[PDB]
Design a protein around this ligand. Sequence first.
Ligand code: F3S
Ligand code: F3S
Ligand code: F3S
Lengths: 45, 322
Amino acid sequence: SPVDGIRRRLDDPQVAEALNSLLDHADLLAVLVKGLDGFVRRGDD
Amino acid sequence: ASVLWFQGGACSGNTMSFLNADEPNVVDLIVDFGLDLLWHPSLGLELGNNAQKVFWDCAKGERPLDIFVFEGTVIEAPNGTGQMDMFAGRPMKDWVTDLAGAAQIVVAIGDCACFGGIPAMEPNPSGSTGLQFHKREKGGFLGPDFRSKMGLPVINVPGCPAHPDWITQILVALATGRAGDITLDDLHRPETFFKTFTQTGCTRVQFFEYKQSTLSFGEGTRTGCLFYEFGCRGPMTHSPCNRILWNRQSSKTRAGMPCLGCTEPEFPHFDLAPGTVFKTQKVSGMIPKEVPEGTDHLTYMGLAAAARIAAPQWSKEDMFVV
Ligand code: F3S
Ligand code: F3S
Ligand code: F3S
C-alpha cells in the first residue's frame, strides 16, 4: 500500500535515524520558519 | 579631614552642583562625615584677614590640609602673572601652587580646574589652564609629575559642572576608609564614574542601536537618539550621567539635549566653532565625522545600515510620550 509503504520507511533504520535527527533539531527548523514568518509580517516595515 | 575649596576661573557651577548633593547632602557631608570644610568662597564664614589666615595656615603647613578642592581654571594671564585672578592678596595661581603642594589630596572639580574648560577656549583671554591638564594634554598648571602628599595626581572630577555625586561619593570614600577603592583613569578621573559613557543608561540607546535619529527639538525628542542630528557626544564621552541621574531626575540626553561631552578634556569640543553646536558634523552628509568610542567608520557604518534595515517599528515612533 502507498501509506503502508511510507509506514515501512518509518521502521527502516537509516530512514528512522535521519527522521529522529530531524526531530532532534526540530526546534531550529521551527525557529527559522518563525523567523521567516516574523520577517514576512514585518516585510512592510 | 580638612577641606579647602578654592575657586579660580570658576563660575561656581561645580559648587552649586555640589550643593545639590543628595545621599549625602552637602550639609551631612560637611558635618557628619568628618570633612572639616576649612573655607569655601561660596560658603566660608571668614572674610578678609581671617580667611587669609586660614589660607596661609594651610599653605605654610601651620595646619593640615587633607583635601584641596580647586574649582575653576588656573588663570595665568596677563603674561603669566595670574593677575586676572587675584584672590586674598595673591594671584590665585600662587595660592594653587602653595595649597596643591600642601594638600594630602588635590581634587580638581569641573573641567575648568581639570582641563581648562570653557575659559581655556581660544583665544583664552585669561590664560586659563587646568591643574594638571590643558585640555587633553597632561601637565596643566602643576605639571605632569605633580603628586599630592598622599602620592596621588590631581583627582580630576570633570564635568561642567561636575555632578554632585562625582565629588561627594569620592569624599565619602575618602572619609569612610575607601580611598584605596578609588581608581583613576588616564585623565585622573574616578573610574567608578568614568568607565561608563554618557550613553550608558541613556533612554535613547535603543534608537541609537537602530540608528533612529531625533529630527528636531521639543516634541521631536519624544523619539530618536541625538547622535545623528544634534551632535550628541554620548557614545564618545565617559560619564555616568545616565547611570547617576542629574538632580536625581534626568540627564541632558534623556531630556533631549545632546551630550556636549563635558566630562571629556576637549570640552567644549571644537571650541563651539560655527556649525558644531547641536549639530553632528558629517562627511558626505551621511557619515558622522566622529563615531562612537572604539568603533571605526566602516564597521560603524556597516552596522548602522544593517540596524536601519532591521529597525523595529517602535524605534521609529514616539516613545517618551505624554
Ligand atoms: S560649571 Fe563652571 S567652574 Fe568651570 S567646570 Fe563648568 S565653567
Ligand atoms: S543613545 Fe543617548 S547619549 Fe546621545 S548618542 Fe544617543 S542620545
Ligand atoms: S555634556 Fe556633560 S553632564 Fe553628562 S550628559 Fe554630557 S557628560
